[PDB]
Amino acid sequence: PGADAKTVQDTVTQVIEQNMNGIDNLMYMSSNSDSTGTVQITLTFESGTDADIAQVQVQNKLQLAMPLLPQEVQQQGVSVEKSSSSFLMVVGVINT
Amino acid sequence: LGTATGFDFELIDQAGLGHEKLTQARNQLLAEAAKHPDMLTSVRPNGLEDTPQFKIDIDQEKAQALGVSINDINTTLGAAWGGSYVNDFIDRGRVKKVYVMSEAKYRMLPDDIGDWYVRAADGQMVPFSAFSSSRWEYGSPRLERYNGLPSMEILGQAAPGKSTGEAMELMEQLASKLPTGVGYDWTGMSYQERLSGNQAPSLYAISLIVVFLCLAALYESWSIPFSVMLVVPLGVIGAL
Amino acid sequence: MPNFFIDRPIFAWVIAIIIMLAGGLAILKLPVAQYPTIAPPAVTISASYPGADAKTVQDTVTQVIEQNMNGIDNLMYMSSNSDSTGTVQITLTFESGTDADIAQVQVQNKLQLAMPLLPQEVQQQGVSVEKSSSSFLMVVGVINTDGTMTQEDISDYVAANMKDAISRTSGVGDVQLFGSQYAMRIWMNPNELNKFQLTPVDVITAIKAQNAQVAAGQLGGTPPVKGQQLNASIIAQTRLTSTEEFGKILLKVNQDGSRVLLRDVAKIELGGENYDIIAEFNGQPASGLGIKLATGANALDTAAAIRAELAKMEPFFPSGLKIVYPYDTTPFVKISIHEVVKTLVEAIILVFLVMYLFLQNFRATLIPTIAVPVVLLGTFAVLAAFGFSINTLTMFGMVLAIGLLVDNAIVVVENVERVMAEEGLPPKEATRKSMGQIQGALVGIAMVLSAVFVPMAFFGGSTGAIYRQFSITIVSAMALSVLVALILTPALCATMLKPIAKGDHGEGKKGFFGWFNRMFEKSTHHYTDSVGGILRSTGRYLVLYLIIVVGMAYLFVRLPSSFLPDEDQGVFMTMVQLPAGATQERTQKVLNEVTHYYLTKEKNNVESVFAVNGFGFAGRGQNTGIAFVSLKDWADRPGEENKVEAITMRATRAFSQIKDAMVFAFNLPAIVELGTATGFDFELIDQAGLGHEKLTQARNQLLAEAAKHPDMLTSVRPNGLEDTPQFKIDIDQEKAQALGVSINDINTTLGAAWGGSYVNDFIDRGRVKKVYVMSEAKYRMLPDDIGDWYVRAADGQMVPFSAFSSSRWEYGSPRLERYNGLPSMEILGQAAPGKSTGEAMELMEQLASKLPTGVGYDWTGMSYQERLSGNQAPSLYAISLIVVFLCLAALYESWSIPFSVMLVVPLGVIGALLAATFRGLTNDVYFQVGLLTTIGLSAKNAILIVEFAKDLMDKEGKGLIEATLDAVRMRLRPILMTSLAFILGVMPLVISTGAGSGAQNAVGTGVMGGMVTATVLAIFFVPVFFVVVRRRFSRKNEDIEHSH
Amino acid sequence: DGTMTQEDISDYVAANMKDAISRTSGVGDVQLFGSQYAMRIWMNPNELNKFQLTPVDVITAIKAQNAQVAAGQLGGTPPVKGQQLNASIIAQTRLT
Ligand SMILES: CCCCCCCCCCCCO[C@@H]1O[C@H](CO)[C@@H](O[C@H]2O[C@H](CO)[C@@H](O)[C@H](O)[C@H]2O)[C@H](O)[C@H]1O
């Protein structure tokens, strides 16, 4: 919260990236750090890789990098998730 | 997946170069790409341009002389202007966050900075303006990295009539003329071609060889299979 | 089938071709490895506590983690080292076949319960969980050939630009930097600190406050007021980037307004996170990456991927920077495999030549020959089908299978040839007649033969996977060659064989073939004459046979037994260990001596030496080091004296004359995680809170008692380090309270100055790196230096350490070991010459039962493996022999006639035993599988002999003796063709020098010896076997005529 | 033999048996029917009041005086060249 892109990159992104070692079947890794105080690191695995094993290996390497992150970032927590781009549907809720 | 005839290219800082030199190398690559409308079209950054930002320098000596601590100064600035997650409360049986932050009208403009006071050790309130100075500068609102190195993603496509393979070949050629320390890589749809497009030839070959061998077995003949294999273009011309 | 393809040769071809395409495609895609993986997965936990002594590490980290290690599937045991480098490694070792991914997941789920209980400084160093081999896959070295970069420069370059990408490469289980990344180093001066009434606590506070990255929000940030037109990020403090910026950190402003800057109380410089690891490549400054393979990953693929990654980095190197390859286990695998491929190709050429000697027409010799590549290539397809890899064992399976393969096609071609020499029938009809009489037998034989090889697919333990590689490869190839002989060979016979007129034996041919044919024909007659003779005696040969069986027994019980030969792999390692307390400088002196020896005394043999000071097999320390040695090619290192075993012996002997260090060169074992045989791995255990000193005393008593049994045990020794002097300092609580100095200030001042303290991060050329505060060297060298450090009391007074503390020398451990959660001390040793490992262990157990109360023991590693136990040989081969007899009984519809075939077994074994015995070889995996190969094939020769004889006595009239003679007459040529072709085919193996020639010699010698005696002897003894067994288990009336 | 009470027995099995049992083959979870020893400080509020102390002071002194300190080394790296002595500095250790 309230971090500029450089701050995000140099206290969060680089630290997580430096810890993404010893994970199987990684093809490549990319990230964005922006001035909305947000970072997303995406790791892409070989076709046929077990998506659950990929995710738990990532999340376990992250777990061990958490103590190296800023306190307020540890507070917000760092989400590790499977990446989909398709929704089955979007339910809107409005007040009229 | 793909933009069809599209490619997905990463410009990479391979040395100590930094965001500005990487941006200059990107602009150099983009200008050169633009000079080949015949081959390349719509090659462009995927990310964001540098923007003005407000640099504020805390004066350590003056803070120390006024008895104002750097932690008070920095949480005052950040909490007021950036907002700050304090802890949790319980709203109707669900745990939720508590945030402190300045009401909007006191964190809108540079003159507002001086309306925030910090308490010194001796009880006095010190306006932020007494121990800081500010200036405009440019910086990035979105920094990209690729395989752990600073990067800039570039999108584009083969010009009409041209193959994506052709368009990628030029991009590598243009990229080979960039400043020292600047490298590149293919990602996404492009990565899955420089690897997963070398296959088509050998798979079609296996198909054609096994077809011939099955036919030769059927007809007990090494030549008669040819009279069947010759049909292929007859359907294909009509589809085309 | 044979009839079908006799009419349809092109369909036959199409089947053969599809099989080869499938094999060919398997070969391009199949994993290649030296051996099947038989090593138990190991997960390692590593952590670091900067400036901690071994006990602090143990009681504050290691015990905490160990106590949370439970409910983990397939855990065999756990071991740990806590050392005065501040390092912990905990190794959890799992059952063979454990999914290493899940092992790692389950270990980490427990570890995360311990994590919050660990010291903060330990958590910030990052603890790691890895799943990899214990040994290095390769060492990637980096030098600067322009001398433009120091050791420290190169190390930082490597850490900052190369290591991470390599660390992320799939199959890379662990990466060790030989050197250290740069950190912002703040070297504190206690004199200057006291002059300005500051301490390391103030220095640390100032750095955290002034090397900061502040989140400051935005101008016009959401939610905004209405009408807002400006939106921009506020940028406040950012991480410092240079020594200059750190130097001007403001510590305080003096009473008269002057400033005290960080550079006024410290030297500030870019320097290593640590200064323990220093490497050289052939004497020059170097750094590097020691790379370990992730559990179960493919070594050749992982190495290819590492090279591809390094290739991406090279174009951006600073000037002079260069990658070198001082140590790589990879090449030997590729090379030794190709050497076997080469001998398989030579085998096919040799086969072609021997075929051309008996079949004297190019087209006719192509028939048996083409079978080889069809079968062999199809075997790769079957291996793919069953998830096997291309490895040393499957490749040698192919080779050992050559005789069994080629024999099916030879049996078919030869028999067709004879049918055309006996009756003058034309090719297409001759092969039909021929397939009619043998095809059933070929299929039957494939069944009995599978009984000799399938049982060893059921060996248990780690050893079993080895034998299963052979079993499946040989059974598959053998099954494929029967198929190939029923489909392709009959077709090729009916189309490519030259018509033979009746009664013709080419005796009236031209030059040499005409001569050869005349010799063979007369030899055949002199052959049949000889046998006809012995059949009239028989009693004589029955006795001679028992002689052979007895000698066979003799040789066998006196042939030593090994597992897999030790190969010269063109690389090896040298271990350097000085006593704890030794300095880095003395360790460098001993490394210089090691390096010197290889560069000057082994000029002709050693290509390079990558030596590292501060890293050893058991990990970081001032008193340890290692040298990685790469030899010149095997080709340029001719003779036994120039191979790894002779080199390492010479080297170790020369190094024994090095003062006050343990230095030895050793060749890496075939496996490793198998057991450098004769060796045992012992754990002494503190089972009752006895404590370190008592365990030591118990250890010493055991070591003493062991030494006085040199007949049984040799080199029984501790694996760890001896206690050393340590500086004990007591803080006086009352005095501190009285003076008003906080214990926290005291401890931080002490620890930061003498141990160093990781404060926070900074940005060095775009990359986040660490900032370290520590005393400059010259103020943390001497005991008296302690009192030059001052702490500030509450009332502002500077108080020297000497005012609130006292100190004394004492002894302590630099390396505390634990085994399965308890204090331990590992003890290594071996069986004395002539006595067995099991013997040595029982003695060790007997000695260990006499130690003081509360002291127990346990076996681990190689000694754990052998106690689940082996000795499954007798049973499995016993089953094998029974099933073979049962299969033969079905074949002959007789309970007795099988014995006439099975008696042939000793005749090849004796030749293999003689050959191995007098070449000084051993009873190992290659000897054993070779024996089954020889036995199978001569069993097969015997089967077709008595099958032919039995047919004569049954279908035709022919009495016993006549049938036997005409049967053996008919099967002499076919037998010789195969034997001579296989015996000559394996010459490449017996004559082999160079990469993997250890395995190749072991293979070839057994087979060649076995094959020669099997061929020469069975040709005479199988006739005896049949006539004697027929007579002994005779019914009522026969022999004298047989009706019709 | 009347030499161990229940609380003793429980400490013995917690401290010497439970860990190994819980790592034994096929064992999934292990419940101790009792409790391992801890060092028990049983405070008396009257005596605390008498000396004007609280549990806060007690807790503070225990963290300060029951400590295991990383204290560094003599002659550790990087050394002054020519250094002969390398030795661990041992400061406060845990009370026992
Ligand atoms: C007598 C006939 C049967 C005997 C011959 C059998 C040979 C068996 C030993 C082969 C060892 C396997 O070695 C294997 O070689 C092939 C061919 O270069 C490699 O194949 C590699 O190069 C080829 C092109 O040259 C590519 O199509 C392939 O994508 C690439 O991986 C494999 O990566 C390697 O693992």
Residue numbers in the entry:
A (entry chain B): 50 to 145
B (entry chain B): 674 to 913
C (entry chain A): 1 to 1044
D (entry chain C): 146 to 241
From the reporting publication:
The AcrA-AcrB-TolC complex is a secondary active antiport system in Escherichia coli, powered by the electrochemical proton gradient across the inner membrane of this Gram-negative bacterium. Its biological function is to capture cytotoxic compounds from either the periplasmic space or the inner membrane, and to expel them across the outer membrane, into the extracellular medium. AcrB is the inner-membrane component of the system, and is responsible for both substrate recognition and energy transduction. The asymmetric trimer structures indicate that this domain also cycles between three distinct conformations, and point to several ionizable residues in its core (D407, D408, K940 and R971) that might function as a proton-relay network.
To further assess the proposed proton-relay mechanism and its influence on the conformation of the TM domain, we solved the atomic structures of four AcrB variants, namely K940A, R971A, D407N and D408N, all of which abolish the drug-efflux activity of AcrB. Electron-density maps for these variants could be resolved at resolutions ranging from 2.0 to 2.3 Å, which are sufficient to discern the precise configuration of side-chains and structural waters inside the TM domain. In all cases, the crystal structures represent an asymmetric configuration of the AcrB trimer. None of the substitutions studied caused significant changes in the internal structure of the R1 and R2 repeats, compared to the wildtype L, T and O states. The relative orientation of these two repeats is also unchanged in the K940A and D408N mutants, as is the side-chain configuration of the proton-relay network, aside from the mutations. That is, these two substitutions appear to perturb the conformational cycle of the transporter by altering the energetic balance between the L, T and O states, rather than by precluding the protomers from adopting native-like conformations in each of these states. Similarly for the D408N variant, D407 is predicted to become protonated only in the O state, while the substituted N408 is evidently neutral throughout the cycle (K940 and R971 are protonated in all states in both mutants). These results imply that the ionic interactions across the R1-R2 interface that stabilize the L and T states are weakened in the mutants. By contrast, the O state is probably less affected (K940A) or not at all (D408N), since the repeats become disengaged in this state. Because the porter and transmembrane domains are necessarily coupled, it is conceivable that the DARPins inhibit the structural impact of the mutations, that is, only the strongest perturbations (R971A and D407N) would translate into noticeable structural differences in our experiment.
